[PDB]
Task: structure prediction
Amino acid sequence: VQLQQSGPVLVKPGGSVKMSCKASEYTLTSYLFQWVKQKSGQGLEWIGYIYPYNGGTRYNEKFRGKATLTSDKSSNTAYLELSSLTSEDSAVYYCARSSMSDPGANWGPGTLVTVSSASTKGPSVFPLAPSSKSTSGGTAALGCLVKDYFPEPVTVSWNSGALTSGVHTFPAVLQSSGLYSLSSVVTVPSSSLGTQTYICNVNHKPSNTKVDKKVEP
Amino acid sequence: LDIQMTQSPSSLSASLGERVSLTCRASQEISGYLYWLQQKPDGTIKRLIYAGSTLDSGVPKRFSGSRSGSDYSLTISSLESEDFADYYCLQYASYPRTFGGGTKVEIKRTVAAPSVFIFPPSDEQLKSGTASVVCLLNNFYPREAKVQWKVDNALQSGNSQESVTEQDSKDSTYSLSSTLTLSKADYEKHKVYACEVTHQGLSSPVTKSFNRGECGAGA
Result:
């Protein structure tokens, strides 16, 4: 149960955007795709549905006809296109597949759309090196500062996902420069520093940037 | 028309291991076509219950769903740290599909003093022309915490920003970062950078600092 959705995008005001949603399996059979919108920090709102079987569609009146839902039977993919974009459109969009067996059976991860006149910018990744000033007991703290990027979001993993316990990735903060910044920290064995490598994998899909930074003591 | 879903409470606090319940009231008959979902901090949404009381096969027995007239409730028998998230009800008896306002679950746990660490700016950032000094308050509880910056014994003001994580999915604690941002020039002009933190779990305020001259280690 894991629906796939297209990545995050930055789009200028007045423009449009089209996002996709497809099952991670051939699936087949008659199913319906439900779409949902969520502004940052707010609740969920139903956008509408697209019924591949007959091409039927239905939309929440609140979108004033700005949303268009379509689908491609061959690829089992559903699309959501939003027009004449405004800041009101900056939000995360989700898709869910229903009817088959369920009732909101599977959900996609969501697609974060940011409407802005500002240009995309990849982050600079600096190390937060472990030292006696970040070590207590046999435990050392270390991390990565993901600075000056736009727009959201960025993803941070440690050692290709092999390190998850103790990882704390802070909420991005908008700086006075209009760019975002955040840190991701993790605690590890102080004795491992000489043998084990610790690398933060940073991905900023809006700028198509990916950086892996090894954090040295 | 438009079926209204009234969910309560908006925010819920409870000790780990307790049994908690969320209610959703339908303004119209929905014939058990009520759905419960969980949205974790990282955005992940998953089906918990459907048909009012049917449990998703992938969800643990701790989650239960019931109905009493126009009242529908989601019950989590034994709260776990992993349950920290926002919960929403959704009726699918008719269109438009409508959601409840949501419930945010807060987890109460034993007090935990934070471990305090400080990080000098990296040489790499300095080359860029900027300096970020980071103070980390790790794994504490409750949320209440005060962090003050002193540069060469002078209290700092207006040049730092703090960020806090949501309660940890494993132990329900918080972590906080306080970042002091300076121009490379201003960072090079001073030597002692201190982070002073006050927290309930700490007997007295703790001060963590470093001397730019000694670098990050003991040079």
Q: What stands out?
A: Chain A touches chain B through 50 residues (CB under 8 Å).
